[PDB]
Paper text:
As it is possible that constrains imposed on the filaments by their tight association to the base could result in structural differences, we sought to obtain structural information for needle filaments attached to the base substructure. Fully assembled needle complexes isolated by affinity chromatography were subjected to cryo-EM analysis. PrgI needles were boxed out from fully assembled, intact needle complexes and segmented into square particles for 2D classification. The α-helices in each PrgI subunit and their N-terminal loops pointing to the solvent were clearly resolved in 2D class averages of the helical filaments. The helical parameters, rise and twist, determined by helical indexing of the averaged power spectrum were measured to be 4.24 Å and 63.35°, respectively, which are in close agreement with the previously reported values for the cryo-EM structure of isolated needle filaments. By applying helical symmetry in the EM reconstruction, we obtained a 3D map of the needle filament at 3.7 Å resolution as determined by the Fourier shell correlation (FSC) at 0.143 cutoff. The first two residues of PrgI are flexible and could not be resolved in our map, although the 3D map allowed the unambiguous building of most of the side chains. The resulting atomic model is in good agreement with the cryo-EM structure of isolated needle filaments, except for a slightly smaller rise (4.24 Å versus 4.33 Å in isolated needle filaments) in the helical parameters. The structure of the PrgI monomer extracted from the cryo-EM structure of filaments attached to the base is also entirely consistent with the structure of the monomer extracted from the cryo-EM structure of isolated needle filaments (the Cα root mean square deviation [RMSD] is 0.509 Å over 78 residues).
Author numbering:
A (entry chain N), B (entry chain H), C (entry chain D), D (entry chain G), E (entry chain M), F (entry chain U), ...: 3 to 80
Write the structure that this text describes.
Amino acid sequence: TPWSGYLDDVSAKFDTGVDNLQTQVTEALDKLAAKPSDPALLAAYQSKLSEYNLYRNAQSNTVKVFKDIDAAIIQNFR
Amino acid sequence: TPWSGYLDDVSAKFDTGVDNLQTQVTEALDKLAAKPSDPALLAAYQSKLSEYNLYRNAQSNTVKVFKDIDAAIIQNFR
Amino acid sequence: TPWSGYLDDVSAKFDTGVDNLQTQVTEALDKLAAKPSDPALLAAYQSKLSEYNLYRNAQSNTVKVFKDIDAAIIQNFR
Amino acid sequence: TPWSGYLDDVSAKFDTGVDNLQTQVTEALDKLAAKPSDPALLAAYQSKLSEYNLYRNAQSNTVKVFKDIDAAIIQNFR
Amino acid sequence: TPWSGYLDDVSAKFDTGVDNLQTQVTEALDKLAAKPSDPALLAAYQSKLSEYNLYRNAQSNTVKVFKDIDAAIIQNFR
Amino acid sequence: TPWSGYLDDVSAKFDTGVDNLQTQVTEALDKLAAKPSDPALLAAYQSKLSEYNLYRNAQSNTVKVFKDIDAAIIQNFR
Amino acid sequence: TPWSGYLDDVSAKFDTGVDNLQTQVTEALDKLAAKPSDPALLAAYQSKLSEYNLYRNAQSNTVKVFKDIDAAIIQNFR
Amino acid sequence: TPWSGYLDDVSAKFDTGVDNLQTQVTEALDKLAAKPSDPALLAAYQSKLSEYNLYRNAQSNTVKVFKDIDAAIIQNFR
Amino acid sequence: TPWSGYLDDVSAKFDTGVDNLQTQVTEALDKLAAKPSDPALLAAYQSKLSEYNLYRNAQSNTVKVFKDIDAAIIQNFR
Amino acid sequence: TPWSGYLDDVSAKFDTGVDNLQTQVTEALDKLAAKPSDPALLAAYQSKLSEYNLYRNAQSNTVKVFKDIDAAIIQNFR
Amino acid sequence: TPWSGYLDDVSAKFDTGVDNLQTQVTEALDKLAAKPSDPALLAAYQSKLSEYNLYRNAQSNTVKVFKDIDAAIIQNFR
Amino acid sequence: TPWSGYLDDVSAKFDTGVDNLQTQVTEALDKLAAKPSDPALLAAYQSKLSEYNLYRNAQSNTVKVFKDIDAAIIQNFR
Amino acid sequence: TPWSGYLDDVSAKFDTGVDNLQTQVTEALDKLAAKPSDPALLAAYQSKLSEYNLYRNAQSNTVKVFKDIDAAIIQNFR
Amino acid sequence: TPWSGYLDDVSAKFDTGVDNLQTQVTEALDKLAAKPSDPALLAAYQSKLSEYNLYRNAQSNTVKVFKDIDAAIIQNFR
Amino acid sequence: TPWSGYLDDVSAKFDTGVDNLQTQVTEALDKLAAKPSDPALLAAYQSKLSEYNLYRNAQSNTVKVFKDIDAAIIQNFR
Amino acid sequence: TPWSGYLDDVSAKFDTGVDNLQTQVTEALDKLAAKPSDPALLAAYQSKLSEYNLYRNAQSNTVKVFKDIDAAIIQNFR
Amino acid sequence: TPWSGYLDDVSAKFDTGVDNLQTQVTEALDKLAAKPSDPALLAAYQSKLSEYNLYRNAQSNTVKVFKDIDAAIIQNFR
Amino acid sequence: TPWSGYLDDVSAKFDTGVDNLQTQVTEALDKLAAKPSDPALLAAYQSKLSEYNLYRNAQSNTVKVFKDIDAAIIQNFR
Amino acid sequence: TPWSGYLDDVSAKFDTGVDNLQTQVTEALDKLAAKPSDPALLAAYQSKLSEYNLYRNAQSNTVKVFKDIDAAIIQNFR
């Protein structure tokens, strides 16, 4: 069994929270690349790419906060 | 079930708000191409194409604003 | 229900404002073609064709103005 | 009571400043559509439509300026 | 009873301070989507969306300041 | 397979929409050049050349509009 | 009966003082993960996460102070 | 009579030194929340919130210094 | 007597330095709203609104600098 | 004394630089309206109206340049 | 084997997505240069050059977004 | 070796694409000037001068497009 | 049999408590090094590296506490 | 005679080293407030305010260093 | 003697480097205001105003760089 | 044999992980410098330079984290 | 010595490049005004006035380009 | 020997990469100034000036990127 | 003989390592000040000023590291 700590659980709440956003960004970019001027494909790709920016920022900043929570508790052992 | 975030909902309010504007632009251009000098078809195509310009601009600028709302909230986690 | 935006309403105020000017130009040209030297038919066709020129110009320039009103509002979202 | 912020007040100074310019543009276009070649109706509609262009541009650019005033004050909290 | 701390009170002063700004942005966007070229609906949506940007920025930066007030007091226990 | 994007499809809707207008302009000019004073050939060439002017203008202005739709979406990625 | 000393009482005054802050941080993160761009969920999660930082720091620094009170009394037995 | 030591006097010199800064921050935030885009209210709230940051930091660091003065005198009893 | 600290004095040097710029922006916008196409009123409103932008930016950035002066002195107490 | 900043001085150098150009445009238009076919009045009104166009453009673009000079200095305080 | 990272893969999805758009722009410009007034060659070159503009902009802005995704994750290592 | 960049290559594709159009315009104008009423020389000079207009416009607008392609890539380095 | 004392048992509770965290940090860094811009690999490496920081700090501070427990018991033999 | 220790001498070397920098910052801010858009006054105020930031930081960090020199000598009396 | 630090010297290298550019902008604007349509005065004023923009930007950005050089040296005293 | 510690191994996992990214940045810049307007060379250089930024940041921040892991273990020897 | 920068040199290359074009336009207009129907004076004045239009446009657009070259270099100091 | 660092080498790769582009812009402007209406000299000057814009932008943005690479490495010494 | 310790040697390795970088920054700024719009002087000054930033940061951070090496050795005498 692969081990997963508490920060691995917080980082995987976002991974299991979105269903296939890592796939839909890949699929919308592959549909965009075949024809990069259809406004039905650009506006669909903007809304996924702007979503994927806020996905990776809110994931990475939450893990940073719970790091500095624990690093100020663990410093208080001594 | 295909996942759709909040920016996917704002981009799909415009898609469900207009009924078949993506179709009517395609249908009016197909009626125009068969006879590109009828003023009943040019003036009908102008009013749909000028509409479709304001549709894709107001969609794409609204998603840009809600991006910079969230990117100034998520930066305040740390 | 076929969708009609605001520019579709301004372009259709001229269409519903005149009753059958798109028909009377077609009917006067069909009466002219059968006998293209009657001054009762030429002077009746001049007054409809000069009317139909000012109809399509005042329609098409009004839609152009309300386009550049909105394209200078929508540019001010960002 | 419907809430109205400061930018809602600046956008409503222009709305209450003009009396019925949103109505007069609608009324002059309805008088124009019934007879789109009267120069008494075209020149009256030009002066209202050119007014309504400068109304919506000076409204929308003023709200844009007071946005970038506040977004450079609120960025200075942190 | 759901618990609400001091930062929950500062974040809810803005929520109770505006009456229904979270609703009016949703209602004005729903009125905009049905007809995205009416200047009466675009200029009304600009003034609410520019308001909603300054609402979420002044909320999120105030909570950030009171965080760094407390994190420099609580660090002075030891 | 030769690639054709979305603007290539809009420019080829006009090409496939007219059947042989690029040929009929060439054929009517070749019939005109052999005898450039027959009114049956001048009036047939006027109606094709005035058609071919409105064909290339409505093609080239439609591609220009869909360019400025996409260049205002793609600018909103960043 | 599980034993709880004096430092266990000081650490459990904060646990019983907040009602369900350990739950509300978990519940707000679970509501955030399903849709990580709603500003109603980000600003609600910021105010709980900034609260939970000051909860664990003021708990852990208070226990550190009462440790160094007692370790300077108990050193004075000999 | 509620007892107040020497560090209670140093912490209350700042409390009695400012008159109602704990009130003016609360009053300016309540005036800000009703209309969070007035630059007369944002710039008035910035100058009080930046003041209240330097108030709580200079209070909390002064009490920390007089603690480490006394903890290096009291350690010299033995 | 309402208390005013040092940052309150720097923010009020700009308030007392300009005489009635908060009034003249309000008065010029009220004169503009009654007739938003007079170039004598637009060019007078541009010069006040561009002034009021540089007023609130130079006020808010000066208070930010004197904050980070003091927050690097007060951090050096301990 | 009504206050006038630096941009108010640059906008009033053009106002005091021309003597009565705001009056001469008004006076020449009033002489034109009484008899709008005299070439001595049309050619005199063309030279004032073409002057008044270059007056308001060179005024409004100069104030725009000195705005973006100052907004790139004031941004360099922080 | 020449190495290609993740941004090299996103930049090469557009390169492999279009088949020979870098060639067709070169070939249509070479056909245009031999005879720069054929409307069959100008309208074919407009649709490729307007396509090639949207190709290089959507490529270069996508790589910019995935840069600022990663530069806000990698900054959160420390 | 005189250096020639990419825009120098696009501007020289038109120069090498036409053989001696810069010479034929000069030669036809020199034949026209000796006898400026021969219809064999006027109609030959019209077809070269109308060609030379479309040569310098399609050259100068192509270089402008490839400039704004690169200035939107190079802006994305930072 | 290799000997392991009590502090060796406390340091090996963390080693046996995590399964292969010393391996997963090594494996995620080896997957990162082959392509250091994939956000699926950066965000997976952040959550393991922030975990591995809290692993080695909570291990090393626990062994330090049980050292100073024993060094204040063993000093009380004499 | 008012007493001044060694740290009072180091803090007063900077005070006597600059002549009237505490006055010139006050005088340049008073000249700025009367007209906050003159670039001759903004660029003169930037160079004094950026100087006054480096004055108070280099003063306050030097006194901090000579404190931690002495607090590691005085701790070595016992 | 009025004191001038190092940033005062860098800001005064630009002041003494140009001879009377602060005067020539004032003199060319005074010559422009008396006659704002002479192309000999507009093109002379463009070249001075575009120069004065690059003067105040290169002055203000150089002082900003030498500030952040020193603020990263002075932070390394402690 | 040149010695290489553990941080030398982590810094050389990135060096051996990419194959010749230090060479490809040098080679793409040398191809760019010979012709700095080819979009095939700019877009190829953007994707390598944006890659090389994320290479040196993820290398340098990983070495910083493993430094502060070890400096909090080695401090616990005493 | 009157100072002349680089843009003053580019604007004076056109002034010294033409010999007396500012004089010949003045002299040909003075010869035209005495007898404004001589075709030897009209055709001589057309060729100078059409020259003087291209002189002031190519001067004023070149200075605009070298402005936006420098304003994108000077912005890169910070 | 005049010293040249690494950024001096990157800025001189563009200088040695182009052969005499700093000379050809100067030579083409000197040929243009003697006769500023020859289309053989305008179109040759456009292609060099549009080249020289992309030369100085790609030089200045590359040096900016390698600055922010190094300023994020050198910040990680401490 | 003026004394120079070990940190004086590390700070003077950078001083003797660069030849005349303290002079070339002074010389390039003096060449810039005489003509602050030449792109040959701005791009030469950018590459020296960006170099001089990395010179003083890598000098000042190296001396800070060797300070905290020695202050953790010298603390271990007692």
